[PDB]
């Protein structure tokens with residue numbers, strides 16, 4: 001804008017573009033996101049003003065919300081790296097387990113807070129998880145799937161990642177619960193551990209089937225109500241479940257146990273962020289500093 005000097009493009013979302021920018025005045029360096037319209041639905045404009053009050057050490061702070069000229073600009077505190085780039089940078093050696101554990105622990109604290117305040121993230125992915133030199137990791141880019149309804153995509157079109165999407169969303173459940181964020185985090189935890197996306201689907205059905213091939217095609221026994229889901233088809237192939245020992249080696253039993261609870265098919269059986277924080281896997285959690293090359 002006129003009060004911000006754009007340093008560079010931080011990212012191109014399907015719904016908005018993100019810039020690293022300096023407040024010509026406060027001298028502060030921030031992440032500026034301009035959102036796409038007739039005047040942007042006020043229904044969200046009030047929903048956004050809510051996230052502004054949602055402050056926690058593991059949630060990227062929303063500093064300012066500026067509504068003007070058909071554009072909505074979200075001003076966020078700036079962090080230097082995201083988890084996707086960090087994992088790519090650590091692919092050769094892998095992120096040390098104590099750091100993986102610290103990150104998972106902090107993200108769960110962030111979610112327990114969001115969830116206790118009736119706020120769902122809805123689109124957790126490594127790219128939306130920001131880290132700094134002090135060992136913190138923060139939830140970013142929350143709601144963008146509840147504002148502009150269900151539009152086409154984006155200008156020149158960009159492929160949305162389905163890899164972290166919960167099965168109930170893929171099966172057409174219209175009402176997401178806090179459980180979809182736990183699922184996404186479980187997928188991310190597995191990914192930090194194996195250094196490979198857990199369910200790299202390239203279509204909604206391929207995403208769903210990759211989940212079924214690994215966790216077994218769900219049925220009424222493991223997921224009461226699943227065969228009544230909107231997009232469920234009796235014709236889905238029936239795959240047996242694989243052993244977690246094979247899915248996230250060499251993760252220890254404490255980790256595999258927590259992961260299995262984060263990946264339960266039934267949203268109602270899936271562990272809550274709060275309960276996950278009490279899992280034995282975090283008995284020896286610490287806060288290591290990552291090796292960040294900026």
Ligand SMILES: Nc1nc(NC2CCCCC2)sc1C(=O)c1cccnc1
Nearest residue numbers: 010031076077078079080081082140141
């Ligand atoms: N606060 C913040 N800092 C960023 N720094 C970036 C991180 C990657 C490397 C360059 C600096 S991105 C970002 C976001 O709020 C954000 C993130 C994803 C999607 N939409 C918004």
